[PDB]
Design a protein around this ligand. Sequence first.
Ligand SMILES: [Ca+2]
Ligand SMILES: [Ca+2]
Ligand SMILES: [Ca+2]
Ligand SMILES: [Ca+2]
Ligand SMILES: [Cl-]
Ligand SMILES: [Cl-]
Lengths: 368, 367
Amino acid sequence: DTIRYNFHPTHIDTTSFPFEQWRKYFKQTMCKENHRLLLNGDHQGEASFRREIAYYLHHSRGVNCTPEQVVVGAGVETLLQQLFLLLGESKVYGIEDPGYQLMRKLLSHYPNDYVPFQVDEEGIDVDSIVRTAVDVVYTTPSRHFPYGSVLSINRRKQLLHWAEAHENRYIIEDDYDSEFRYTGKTIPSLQSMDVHNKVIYLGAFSKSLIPSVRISYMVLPAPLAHLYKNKFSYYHSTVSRIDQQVLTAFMKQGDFEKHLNRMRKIYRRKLEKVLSLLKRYEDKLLIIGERSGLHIVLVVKNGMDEQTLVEKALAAKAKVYPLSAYSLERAIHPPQIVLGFGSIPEDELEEAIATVLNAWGFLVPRGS
Amino acid sequence: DTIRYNFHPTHIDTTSFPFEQWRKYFKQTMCKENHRLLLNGDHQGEASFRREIAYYLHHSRGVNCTPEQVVVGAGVETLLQQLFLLLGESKVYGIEDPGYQLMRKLLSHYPNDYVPFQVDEEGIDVDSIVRTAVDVVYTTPSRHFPYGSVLSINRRKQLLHWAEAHENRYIIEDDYDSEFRYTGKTIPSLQSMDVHNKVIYLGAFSKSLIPSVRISYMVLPAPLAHLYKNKFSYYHSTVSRIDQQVLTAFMKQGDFEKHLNRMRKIYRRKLEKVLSLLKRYEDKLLIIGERSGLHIVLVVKNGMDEQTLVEKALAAKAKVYPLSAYSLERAIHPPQIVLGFGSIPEDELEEAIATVLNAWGFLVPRG
Ligand SMILES: [Ca+2]
Ligand SMILES: [Ca+2]
Ligand SMILES: [Ca+2]
Ligand SMILES: [Ca+2]
Ligand SMILES: [Cl-]
Ligand SMILES: [Cl-]
């Protein structure tokens, strides 16, 4: 087949993107007067761009950093690799389970060991971490993937305390999941509470902007930033100067911020339509983390197993994501599926959900 | 200050670039109909783009590979890092001395050890390699930096033989420096001779095209390519899909090839003007590797040391490159300076060289 509907958690609404503006800024940047942009710039990122990042992160997340603490790289994986090299071979990493598997996967190639920790309604299990001899804790405190959990303000304090207790300890705050929250109290970055230079902040222009441009940023505590600038002095940027300059302009003249607001509205509509439809099956489908992100988790009580649910959906030309993809515990029961609605066009949402539900043997409204 | 003249060996003629065409292809690619390009593509590279790479490499260098053996990454450094992880922690690397320091520097972060080998008129010292217990040999056979040496056809055969002798051995062929040769025999890739899946081929769109776009490629022997696709299945591309698509088009419709020819002419003129001027001081300045690349080496007999020469040049706002920057084995005397003329505009060449010569206490023709 070709797959018709792709319920990917990290997809964006591609049809909505401001092509005209982007093209405009491209036109302004890529031209004879800016010919010097064709040579390589600062490895760490263009100063202009690092500046906008620090501005953006302050407004949006409460992050406090200088431009000289911002490292720009081609995707989160590029930056974590540099981080692993930077912090050294002895560090032991604690990671969330379940969660995105990237961190564990990358660590398989590096000397460093890892330890998984549970996440619950209040975030990562700080009690276990404290007993465990990890040095660096990787966590998504703002909204855990996939369930949407927030790291409670107590645990934030406890974790920062843990980090303060030793010179070797750090926290990696992953905010890959960009700022589409609709419900709950809006709570800031853990980095914003950090007064001890303990938190490394990680994010990307993927769920905002454009995933395929591969533009990501890591914010280092100022000692690490100095060490970074020394260790990696001879490297080159892994992100196009042209693209940096373009995004710099897009941000400076306010269009990025307009984009974000416009998209927030669109995603809100989509999510609400999706919930509107799914809430009708409340006996056999339970939704988790419904008021955050571009995706939800369904617990499915069809007596169909996880694998069956995936295959049936794929047969209907709809790709859906088994939660076991994101888990080291091999038993997930009842079966859970992640659905993301970024790429599903707004006017086809009902049809798309219908397709999946139908393939799963649910009764479906007309026009699918 | 700002530096007025930057004699960087890897710089290109930025003023010459086809902005209009590039912008055209950008316009064609980045638009509502191609909205799916905004999601991430194949980690290894866009199939269209890998295809053009395989085509390009065949016509230009005689490289024989499938698109599925081409890995696209953000600069040579990104790809070598993946390579180091792929081949494992036990491998020992041999590297050229002198040369670009990137390889040594990267290796400092990985478990892997390295050994430098001399380069002469005929390329890397294969005799030493054979005695040495290295597993992977890094070399720039087409045109060594900075002197311009070519790996002789004997040594090519000897090195491939060396590689054939053991299951663990490989050769990294760097063709970062590939396109601008004017003199000597135009000679093919070592990869083209490889029939034993021993050569990893490495190149980039920097000296052609645009350095700052950070688009590079590594061509893996087919067993390694299969291992790569498995080991790194979960990675994402480090190069923008949009930029891939743009360059894909630029290549397909022949604009890349036009670009290359146009640039070859320009660089040739610049080099010839530079030689024309410098040949006048043949007693105190000797030129090396003069008929290759976007740069030359000067041996300077001023009794000024290397450092002095650099500083004097920088005073008067010209940046020049000490050859010691490129060596692991012992201080060079008499001083050598690398001058690259990629970025120096054609109509300012005389002025620029004059600036440097003047600062070094030489007499200047035209006042
Ligand atoms: Ca490991
Ligand atoms: Ca959710
Ligand atoms: Ca090493
Ligand atoms: Ca890139
Ligand atoms: Cl063709
Ligand atoms: Cl110097």
